[PDB]
Amino acid sequence: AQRLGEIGSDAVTWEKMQPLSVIPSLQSNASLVDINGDGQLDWVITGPGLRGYHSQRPDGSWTRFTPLNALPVEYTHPRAQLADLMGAGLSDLVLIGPKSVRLYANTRDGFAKGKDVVQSGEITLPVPGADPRKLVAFSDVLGSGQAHLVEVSATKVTCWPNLGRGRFGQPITLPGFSQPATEFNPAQVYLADLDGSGPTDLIYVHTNRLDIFLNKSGNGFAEPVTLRFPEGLRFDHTCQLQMADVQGLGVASLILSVPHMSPHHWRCDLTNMKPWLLNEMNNNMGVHHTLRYRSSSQFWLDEKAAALTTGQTPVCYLPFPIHTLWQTETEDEISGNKLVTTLRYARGAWDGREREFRGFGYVEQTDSHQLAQGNAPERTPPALTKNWYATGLPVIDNALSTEYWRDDQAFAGFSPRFTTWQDNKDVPLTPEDDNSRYWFNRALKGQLLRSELYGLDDSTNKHVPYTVTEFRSQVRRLQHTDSRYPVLWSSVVESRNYHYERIAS
Amino acid sequence: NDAEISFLTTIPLK
């Protein structure tokens, strides 16, 4: 994906296809899936005796073949499906029958010895692929953040909540969905988080229109919203409805791919904003606040585009788009003045190992005063504050060193200090291995490492900050005699201020 | 204080 148009545009395009410079050689019995749940897709090979994978790293390289530690022989079974059943967010291996399931937990290096889970009571599960008249699939139709088992037929939607480790609860009827009996072809049923929220909506595709049933938080369906196709577009069995966030809007758009003689595509945008976010506040005393949001993925495209234009190779460490706050605006009803803060983000990252978001390494805050018309001749120039934070992923933190305002006649910058606590002394430490190094760096996440304040003036010294602030943090290992991760404590040891007042000297 | 969970969607291939 590339930024289409100028930087700051929200438009998205794709570049001319290029061969990837490197691919795995073994592609006869393999597929691309995140097997570890690390955020890195794995080319996973499960061939005639050979089991392992190649992960796709963020810098574009591939790892060498990594053997799996354990794989069920049933991985390749015709009814094998993967699903999040342990609730770990990992894809577990499961086989489903009507009375029991067989579950192999994903241990993120292979799978665990599986277990046969007997369903309690009289709970009978649907079996995927068993009946062409209905759809059996995993989906968050209850809007709870998990993979529930849902069966969609012409007259009703039934769902068995996932209680974990292969256990399912009683079927829940989710009324409101209804198709004309014999016309109900499951091939026409697609599921989606169209409002960007928990519950997954049911989209029924007809030849000339979409019949969309909004999901009322797992309590049944809304009367369908009918959308019509543009003239000349008709849907059929050779066509496909694809859903994806391809705009940087969070909410996936509906793409109709019609491969006929000259393959063409259409996209239906239902929203330009994620619909449940807080938009406005008004205190009825003249203060009005407007929030705006922008997907993190659009900041990435701007970051990427800027790097391309300077010959640099940007790396995104966040494959899981979030909506960040952008362009907060405060309106003074009564004075007529407005104040807008635009945040720009860069270098954010996903932890991978603990499956958590570490945060944005860089946050840049503008500050613009819109004085009431006729008030003043553009007085009070806009300000800019740059803030660099630790992510605790020293592939990013180490790189922030080049983005700082430079002054050669300056004190040495800071690096984090790692210590322990030995006979009550703050003893310097170099981590023994990667597991410790990881946890020591994890402890740094979110700390401000540096900030700079600039005026966005038209002066000859507009690029020189008024102030520069540097910090040095420290992580102390207090108790390693524990479950593998040690107890760490962290704080700021050094804080250095510089006052330039835009004068470099 | 506060809390946050980042929610991502994972898609199986079968």
Partner: protein, 168 residues
Amino acid sequence: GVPHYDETDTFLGPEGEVLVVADQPRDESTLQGINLGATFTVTGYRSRLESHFSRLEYWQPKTTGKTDFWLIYSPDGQVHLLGKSPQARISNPSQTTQTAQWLLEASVSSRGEQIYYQYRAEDDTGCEADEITHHLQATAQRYLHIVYYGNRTASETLPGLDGSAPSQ
């Protein structure tokens, strides 16, 4: 993943950090002078990331006739009790020993001031038969109903001890 409830699980603190066992367990039956009626294994906990050095204890009875609880010892001597009485617990409505959450129930200051939190359990009211029909239990949810504070008299003990419901 979904908790096993077999002590292989970990817990999150008052801040969503992982708690770890820091101290060897000890046996105790008396809490702030209150004889709880059972011997509890008391396990000390710390956050993996040490926010303000708060210390936590998990009290686990050796008997099936009692439920567990958590205590928090704040750096200022403030002491908190979470999840002792059943209204303070979120637990599997069937296997009720599977407590998912321990909600703050009581708190005592270092100077004798107290707070007691009265929770109300969810129930089958305020709705249509259809709501109940497809969701027969799920009464594990707890809502804060009344927070009682400003004890008329002074006490160094937690107000929730002995399971005594507050009077206004």
